[PDB]
Amino acid sequence: TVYTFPDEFKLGAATASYQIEGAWDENGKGPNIWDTLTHEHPDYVVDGATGDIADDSYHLYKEDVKILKELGAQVYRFSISWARVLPEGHDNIVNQDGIDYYNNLINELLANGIEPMVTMYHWDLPQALQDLGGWPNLVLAKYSENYARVLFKNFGDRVKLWLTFNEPLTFMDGYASEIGMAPSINTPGIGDYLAAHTVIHAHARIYHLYDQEFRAEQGGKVGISLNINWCEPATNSAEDRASCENYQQFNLGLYAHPIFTEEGDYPAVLKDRVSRNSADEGYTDSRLPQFTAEEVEYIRGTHDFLGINFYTALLGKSGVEGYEPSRYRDSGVILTQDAAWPISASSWLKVVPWGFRKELNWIKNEYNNPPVFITENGFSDYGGLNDTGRVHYYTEHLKEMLKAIHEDGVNVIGYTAWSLMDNFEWLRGYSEKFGIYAVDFEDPARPRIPKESAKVLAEIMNTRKIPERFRD
């Protein structure tokens, strides 16, 4: 039984718009911040790669559905490109080609018995909105509401699973480095916190919009996808344990405390440590923005489930490091990775499957066992179809998740593998492969071909259990 998926549990695979679509300026699509980064700053990206074509899923979406059907996916998580739908960012112009494209994809999925799960914002902000400052400018919360209204109105009759944002912990870092994630602005410790603040407000406005304007008719669920690494105490000391709690609160709690707790607001440790550090550095005002009591009440409770992206673990020990100011320095933990952990093709990603179970338990206890949908989990290599490392990664992580469900009572409701196919891996270009299907980026037809991991995941989805040969 510990190896069998619950009957209602949903299994599938995930992608994101800029990573797969191409057609970056086709049929009225406006430019986004990743068009700008890859066009103006190819020195920031491995091989100077761009998403101009990527998997060409704008043209090849029927092929994506075909492979999802072959895999046996019950759910397909994908994102909508804001600037494909609203080319100017604002809602004055709706691009009918963009509406037609996502309707075509949704209708194709449903005709093939696959449920769509839609991420509204997966990092591809319209450049016109970044020109106002982007996420640090709170005016984007209302713009985000207006974007979501267009999405609910056009697609919500057929889409019943929504994520407002994907990994704001990551995309806020686009405001903490001059050479990093789009829009590549160097305001660490200041602009990244402002970006988080706007995202939380935007998420809450979108949830309330759904309640007010769409839920009665559409009957779907709205969540958010938050990434989090497990942080294992370097030693069993109380002080190293404290540092790991700081990590959870500074990385997951930054977003999940305001939304998923009864109290709301940011975690106390986040407010207190930033306030103290800001005072010590001579600022009149804390670098952490504040919610009013009315905002705390508006934001808390804005969820129907929690989306989690889980990949890896770190070791945490008591202490402080990093540049002043920065979120890492403010967090009061010294982070490392254990040399013994198996590696991937991504410097940050080590294979630590038991960390997944620990993280799921941390979330269960902190947030009172919310329904959790694993919206990403996956592994990188540099190429190859006989992807034994990826097969091991998935079978181990799925076993650890099933223990969390069956042994630990964690309410995990679904799981989408990152990714359906090799795609544009952001600053890593096409150099790091996360797909269960391989794609030849030198072939204009971009054929998708199954790796061993696709075959193993198909076997898992078909049998609804971990095969005997992968059990302990």
Q: Is cis: bond before 325, omega within 30 of 0?
A: yes
Distances (CA, A) of 165 to 76, 144, 217, 373, 412: 16, 10, 23, 14, 19
Residue 355 lies in domain: 1-472
Distances (CA, A) of 459 to 28, 71, 278, 453: 41, 8, 53, 10
| CB of 287 closer than 8 Å to CB of 299 | no
Q: Which residues of 177-216 are buried (b: 16+ CB within 10 A; e: fewer)?
A: beebbbbbbebbbbbbbbbbbbbbbbbbbbbbbbeeebbe
Residues ending a continuous segment of the chain before a break (C–N > 2.5 Å): none
Phi, psi at 234, each rounded to 5°? -60, -40
Q: Rounded CA gap, 267 and 455, in Å? A: 43
Query: Considering only CA atoms, which of 79, 72, 78 is closest in space to residue 5?
Result: 72
Catalytic residue among 366, 376, 396, 425: 376
Q: What is the CA radius of gyration of the chain?
A: 21
Q: How many CB atoms lie within 10 A of CB 137?
A: 16
Domain count within the chain: 1
Cα of first residue to Cα of last residue in the chain, in angstroms, is 14
Q: Rounded CA gap, 24 and 312, in Å? A: 32
Phi-psi domain of 25 (left: phi exceeds 0; alpha: psi -120 through 50; beta: other): alpha
Q: Rounded CA gap, 99 and 378, in Å? A: 30
| CB of 465 closer than 8 Å to CB of 78 | no
CATH of the domain at 231: 3.20.20.80
Q: Which burial class, exposed, middle or buried, applies to 128 when counting CB atoms under 10 A from its CB (0-12, 13-18, 19+)?
A: middle
| CB of 162 closer than 8 Å to CB of 210 | yes
Query: Considering only CA atoms, which of 84, 105, 107 is closest in space to residue 94?
Result: 84
Give the distance from CA 271 to its chain's centroid. Answer: 24
Give the distance from CA 240 to its chain's centroid. Answer: 28
8 is catalytic: no
Distances (CA, A) of 24 to 31, 96, 98, 446: 7, 16, 12, 16
Phi, psi at 153, each rounded to 5°? -60, -40
